[PDB]
């Protein structure tokens, strides 16, 4: 459903999704266009900077994309879009209902293979224009000639011909006369990849059992065969700087390098990408260069470089192994928690189910960096426990950042899944901190908070006990015991004077903080799942179990609004930075905006994925949502920062 | 030469001078349009001078057995289960949850034994209670727990008979003139053995006992014996159900330790041998399926303060046989001493010499050997000392070489005061003086 407050801006934190990317070459530089769901992203291969993002989201997922000099050809559901600088220049509708799923571009021809084994040829109108635009003919690979088309390529110096790689065969079409020139002999196992060699009229085929064939497309024979047992081959690339190496890419995430001249195996990069997300999905040498760009389905794009040889006379036999060079990446699993790091809306902290805490930049995607989990030394000098085989921390339930004393000491306080202590982090250093706050009642951490002096962190355990630690020195200061069931929300005043806790027994406790008294206790009518404290207006909102949002102020301890309308469990909510609205999101696939002055629902968005996190910026710039599927962070901009919206209630 | 000709390139006719890239592949300044096969050859030579022709394409197309097998393989060692016996010098041992972590011990854990069949671990110490833990990986819980008042326990053993394998007794004893026997029934019926049937002067403390199997040798009827180490040189063997004193075996010197070996004879008949060591180093072997008479008397080569003998490689008292046909002869015999020296004898040849030489004398840990236990397969020996911290080694054998990667400097072994091997899982339990059983799993099993 279209909205009237927030309009979609971008989905940040995404680098790849395991569509095989395309490389392109403007002049002597290289760009790398990778698909992220329904948009592509162009990267500058010398530094992996994000040059361009495609202007509109395609109506379905981009499934095959190529790149000549200035133009990028992206094939999604039925049609091929021709894009320059992100902005779409042309759209080629195919005459079928079959999904286009391969394409090549050579000459005046764009050739797009669908999944019903038909091939659509498109021609330029006059050979001076920029992209193939008019329909020319249709080719068909029937079941007699070959299997399913597994690749579609044009190996060089072949005057208007096309190498079609089917699952068992290699056909060669003349795309002007519409003819089938040559059909090879069969192959005893199903071939998955193809790459044209820089040797003349040689293609390289990669099978579903472990072998690379070097087919000579003019003799009709195979030149040589390379066997990699029990490995499905997903990429093939060739080195073109006077060193005849081949790089094969294996769907258990391996990148194997071969010398073709002296028939040895140079090196293997093991676990270069995750097998569970597809292995190495596209690996290609930037040509003339000893650097190879890999990309996998785990939302990661890397570069590896070959240093020059260490022997000053031999060289060709002492090949130094490939080392790592720059890389970009994001979360490999959908994020589980979201926060904004500062009031400027520049960085945002983001934790995922793949057990990593990233810090993503809303201004420039090169500044996105993974917060490191390299632990400090123990304070006394004793040994730290844990496994020797280091793994990442359990996935993050909650976090609370308060950069009042930033750079001074620990700054982020975070709570993990089914473990009884809350770690700290430093956002300035972008690393873990020295302290892990215990709950001291053998209960898991259900909530965290920290004061805006930056001195105090608050832990709320599942046995109902708030413990207040000092963020500088890491020791227990106080411990309140009011609740008996799990404490799901803690917050404190902007003047460190009254704190407010809410547990899932449905009591909101109001404590004085300087004196350790309680000021009161208010029993609601459902267990409370989440609190958000708007700190300037002193109004906090509770997501109750009866699917209402109770807005209650902390000064006079009354329920002052009660917002009804959600049909399932409220996953998240957040206040406007001016504290006028509250945006919630719930498991009925909806996001609502409530004007708590008038107490009604301003806007509603039906979004197909359920939004698990909603956060406003600390200025009124952006909304950041986080959904069930999708490894990134969806970013919306409120149009009411530029116009004024009517606080008049919607329905249906 | 070529496997196809398409008959379209010959009648095509290209221009040349329209674009700057094709403007270079002319051979004259008057050429403007050329034939298709000529044009294909021009840009074939141009492709060949952009990317120069390598040697792997025209060099070769597809006693070399080793080179071929190396060019196909990627791993070069035995894979997972086609090993069946341990690799030396590098263990494979993960750490599980500490077994008594569920219910803490109030004393140093003095003895420790697994069940022969069930997943049960019995711990016990000087706080005069004994605890049984259902062990697994994650959650080692406490089955039951029995606190004998006024009776600190020092040795506790699961006994399970060979006839019906349905008794499941626990024999436990400390520095007392009695020994308790709990009959496992899942109230608790325990009995007390407190009568040496005329032999109370030579047995003033029931601390060092061991439980074993004995055959009648006129019927094929087995029964358990407990064996008590007494003052002078005496071992008092008595029935494990009736408590009747059966026989006694006296060695000459200060009796320090003893172990039980079994050897099969025929179908359904075996023979029990008691192996008892002087402090000085001389070893007696008593046949006790007949009257307790000496059959062999030999001497440990070296060794002057002898604390602990153990056998292994077959059925010991800590790897017990559940069925009488599964009784095996022990291969190895380790005699561990006060200096930390452990002689190791191979009884496949060292039952004949009467001054037999050890296959190796280990010297890796330097203080008094207080535990040494063989893994049930008989491929690891575990030396352990309760005198300094972290004094435990697992020596691989037959190679007689200590594993060098475990334990490390960060293994929380503690002051190792007991150790036990699982009969089936390949699993160490190590109890220290703080009251903690730590638990490890050997991934070879």
């Amino acid at each position: 459903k279209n909205s009237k407050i927030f309009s979609p801006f971008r989905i940040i934190g995404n680098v790849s999704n395991g569509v095989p990317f395309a490389t392109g070459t403007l002049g002597s530089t290289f760009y790398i266009v990778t698909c992220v769901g329904k948009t592509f992203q162009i990267y500058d291969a010398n530094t992996l900077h994000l040059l361009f993002v495609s202007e509109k989201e395609t109506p379905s997922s981009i499934v095959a994309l190529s790149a000549h000099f200035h133009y990028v050809y992206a094939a999604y559901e039925n049609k091929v879009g021709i894009y320059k600088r992100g902005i779409e220049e042309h759209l080629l509708e195919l005459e079928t209902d079959a999904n286009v799923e391969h394409l090549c571009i050579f000459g005046d021809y764009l050739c797009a293979s669908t999944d019903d084994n038909s091939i659509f040829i498109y021609k330029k109108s006059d050979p001076q224009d920029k992209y193939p635009s008019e329909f020319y003919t249709k080719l068909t690979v029937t079941e007699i000639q070959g299997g399913e088309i597994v690749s579609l390529q044009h190996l060089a110096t072949y005057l208007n011909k096309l190498t079609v790689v089917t699952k068992s065969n290699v056909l060669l079409f003349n795309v002007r006369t519409g003819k089938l020139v040559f059909t090879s002999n069969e192959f005893p196992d199903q071939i998955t990849t193809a790459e044209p060699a820089p040797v003349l009229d040689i293609i390289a085929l990669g099978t579903v059992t472990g072998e690379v064939i070097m087919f000579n497309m003019r003799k009709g024979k195979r030149i040589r065969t390379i066997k990699i047992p029990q490995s499905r081959i997903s990429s093939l690339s060739f080195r073109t700087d006077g060193s005849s190496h081949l790089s094969v890419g294996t769907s258990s995430g391996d990148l194997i390098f071969y010398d073709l001249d002296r028939r040895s195996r140079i090196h293997v990069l093991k676990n270069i990408h995750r097998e569970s997300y597809g292995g190495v999905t596209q690996a290609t040498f930037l040509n003339g260069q000893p650097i190879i760009v890999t990309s996998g389905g785990d939302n990661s794009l890397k570069e590896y470089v070959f240093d020059p040889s260490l022997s000053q006379g031999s060289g060709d036999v002492v090949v130094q192994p490939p080392r790592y060079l720059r890389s970009r990446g994001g979360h490999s699993q959908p994020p589980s928690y979201i926060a904004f790091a500062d009031s400027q809306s520049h960085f945002m902290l983001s934790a995922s189910k793949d057990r990593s805490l990233w810090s993503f930049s809303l201004r420039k995607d090169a500044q996105s960096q993974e917060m490191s989990q390299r632990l400090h030394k123990k304070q006394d000098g004793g040994r730290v426990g844990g496994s020797t085989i280091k793994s990442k921390f359990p996935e993050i339930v909650a976090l609370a950042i308060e950069n009042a004393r930033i750079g001074e000491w620990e700054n982020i306080i975070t709570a993990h899944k089914d473990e009884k202590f809350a770690r700290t982090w430093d956002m300035r250093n972008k690393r873990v901190g020295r302290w892990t706050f215990d709950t001291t009642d053998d209960g898991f951490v259900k909530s965290v908070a920290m004061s805006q002096c930056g001195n105090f962190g608050f832990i709320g355990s599942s046995n109902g006990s708030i413990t207040i630690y000092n963020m500088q020195s890491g020791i227990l200061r106080k411990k309140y015991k009011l609740h008996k069931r799990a404490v799901t929300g803690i917050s404190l005043d902007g003047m460190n004077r009254k704190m407010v806790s809410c547990g899932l027994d449905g009591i909101v406790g109001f404590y004085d903080f300087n004196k350790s008294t309680l000021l009161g206790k208010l029993k609601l009518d459902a267990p409370i799942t989440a609190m958000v404290y708007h700190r300037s207006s002193d109004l906090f909102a509770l997501a109750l179990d009866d699917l209402s949002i109770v807005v209650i102020d902390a000064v006079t301890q009354r329920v002052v609004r009660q917002l009804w309308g959600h049909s399932n469990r409220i996953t998240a909510f957040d206040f406007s930075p001016e504290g006028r609205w509250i945006v919630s999101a719930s498991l009925d696939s909806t996001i609502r905006t409530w004007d708590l002055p008038t107490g009604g629902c301003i806007d509603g968005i039906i979004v197909d994925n359920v939004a698990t996190n909603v956060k406003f910026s600390p200025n009124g710039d952006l909304l950041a949502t986080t959904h069930v599927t999708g490894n990134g962070i969806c970013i919306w901009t409120n149009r009411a920062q530029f116009k004024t919206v009517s606080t008049r209630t919607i329905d249906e | 030469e070529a496997a196809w000709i398409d008959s379209d390139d010959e009648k095509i006719k290209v221009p040349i001078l329209v674009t700057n890239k094709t403007k270079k592949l002319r051979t004259s300044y008057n050429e403007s349009k050329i034939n298709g096969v000529h044009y294909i050859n021009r840009l074939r030579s141009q492709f060949e001078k952009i990317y120069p022709r390598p040697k792997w394409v025209d060099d070769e197309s597809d006693i070399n057995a080793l080179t071929k097998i190396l060019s196909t393989t990627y791993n070069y060692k035995d894979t997972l289960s086609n090993s069946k016996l341990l690799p030396p010098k590098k263990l494979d041992i993960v750490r599980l949850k500490d077994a008594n972590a569920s219910h803490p011990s109030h004393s140093a854990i003095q003895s420790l034994s697994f069940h022969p069949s069930k997943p049960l671990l019995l711990t016990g110490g000087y706080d005069k209670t004994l605890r049984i833990y259902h062990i697994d990986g994650k959650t080692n819980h406490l089955v039951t727990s029995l606190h004998l008042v006024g009776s600190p326990i020092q040795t506790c053993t699961f006994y399970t008979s060979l006839s019906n394998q349905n008794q499941q007794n626990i024999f436990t004893a400390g520095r007392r003139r009695y020994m308790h026997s709990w009959d496992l029934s899942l109230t608790a019926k325990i009995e007390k053995f407190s009568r040496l049937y005329g032999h109370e002067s030579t047995q003033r403390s029931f601390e060092n006992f061991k439980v074993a199997h004995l055959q009648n040798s006129q019927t094929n009827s087995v029964h358990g014996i407990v064996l008590l180490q007494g003052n002078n040189g005496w071992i008092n063997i008595l029935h494990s159900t009736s408590g009747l004193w059966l026989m006694g075996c006296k060695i000459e010197g200060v009796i320090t330790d003893f172990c039980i070996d079994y050897q099969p004879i025929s179908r359904g008949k075996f023979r029990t041998i008691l192996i008892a060591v002087n402090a000085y180093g001389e070893v007696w072997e008593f046949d006790l399926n007949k009257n307790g008479h000496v059959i062999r008397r030999w001497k440990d080569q070296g060794g002057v303060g002898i604390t602990k003998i153990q056998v292994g490689g077959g059925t010991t008292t800590t790897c017990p046989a559940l069925q009488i046909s599964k009784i095996k002869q022990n291969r190895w015999l380790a005699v561990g001493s006060e200096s930390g020296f452990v002689n190791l004898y191979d009884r496949n040849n060292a039952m004949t010499s009467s001054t037999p030489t050890p296959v190796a004398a280990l010297d890796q840990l330097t203080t008094t050997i207080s535990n040494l236990q063989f893994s049930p397969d008989g491929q690891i020996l575990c030396m352990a000392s309760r005198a300094v911290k972290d004094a435990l080694r697992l020596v691989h054998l037959p190679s007689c070489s200590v594993f060098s990667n475990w334990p490390t400097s960060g293994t929380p072994l503690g002051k190792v005061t007991s150790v036990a091997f699982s009969p089936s899982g390949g699993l160490l339990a190590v109890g220290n003086e703080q009251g903690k059983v730590r638990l490890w799993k050997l991934n070879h099993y």
């Binding site: 002597s28 002007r176 700087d241 003339g288 260069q289 | 095509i12 890239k21 840009l43 952009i50």
Partner: peptide, 28 residues
């Protein structure tokens, strides 16, 4: 002293590439 496995600073170079736009011809 062991051998020095230090990495050089890598800069890209100017490479020539065959473009396939000359691999398409029209008939009269």
């Amino acid at each position: 002293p062991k051998v020095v496995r230090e990495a050089k600073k890598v800069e890209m170079t100017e490479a020539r590439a065959y473009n396939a736009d000359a691999d398409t011809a029209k008939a009269a």
